């Protein structure tokens, strides 16, 4: 099995895991902080997706240190996995172009 596609799938699974655990840990870290909105699991998961995609709707964000740390982990997981998919596509296209020219 090709390495780039394997790492791509691994980053997909790992990203899903980081999204779910990030929602759970976000709710756990944010409850107890007055004014916090990241306190229900469904919209904590929605916020996890927003964070991993950096879509920037700005409707939900953590206010505590540990919630912000969880947030950073989700950000870096999304940036890393999506950049990994980009790199895998690059490797694929370079292979197909290398065969297209008979080299």
């Amino acid at each position: 099995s090709a390495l780039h596609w394997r790492a791509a799938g691994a980053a997909t699974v790992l990203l899903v895991i980081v999204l779910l655990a990030g929602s759970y840990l976000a709710v756990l870290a944010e409850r107890g902080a007055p004014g916090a909105q990241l306190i229900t699991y469904p919209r904590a998961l929605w916020w996890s997706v927003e964070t991993a995609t950096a879509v920037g709707y700005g409707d939900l964000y953590p206010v505590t240190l540990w919630g912000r740390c969880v947030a950073v982990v989700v950000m870096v997981a999304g940036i890393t996995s999506f950049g990994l998919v980009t790199a895998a596509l690059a490797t694929w296209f370079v292979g197909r172009e290398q065969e297209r020219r008979g080299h």
Partner: antibody
Amino acid sequence: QVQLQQPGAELVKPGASVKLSCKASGYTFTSDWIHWVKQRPGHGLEWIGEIIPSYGRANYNEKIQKKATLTADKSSSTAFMQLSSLTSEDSAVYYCARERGDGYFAVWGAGTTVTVSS
Amino acid sequence: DILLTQSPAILSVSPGERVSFSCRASQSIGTDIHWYQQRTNGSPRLLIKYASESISGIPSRFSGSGSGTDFTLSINSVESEDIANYYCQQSNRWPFTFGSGTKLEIKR
């Protein structure tokens, strides 16, 4: 079956303490939170605090004088609220309730009538 | 924290008429409002979740409406068993808070 089992009454002496119990049944999840709500006779509902049994983290209402300490035994599926140094201002019905993680109480216990008197 | 004002505190209606309880929040909270019913010496019973979503086992004459800061619990054709106290619990920001409650009376 009744999902949350609470004792009917507890008699406390002024200055003493009491540990209220809340035994769970039905569907339990790692995402479950158990809340405790205070209702003095004739008054409304007052949120006391919450605990996530699968983790043990508990949060309390900041605006009131902290008299409670929340714990949970995971094997017996039981939530405990320890009220300490009780004044006549603490005589009330104390409910426990379960919350799947949406922020509303789907099921409540029958409530424990706490009377602090000599 | 988020304050929930339930006014009036007492609502008196005739049997069979439509009644509406009001619940106003001190800040915008979307639809994160839930409604409970407590009869005399009873435990609170969830009637409506998320301002308008139905609960299984609750009579269909119970409905909810509103969003932001103004919410309404409505009963079509009030009857004797509807006599109770009604609370509107909020859960948009920590900590969760309750309204002060509205008692429903029936003039028979």
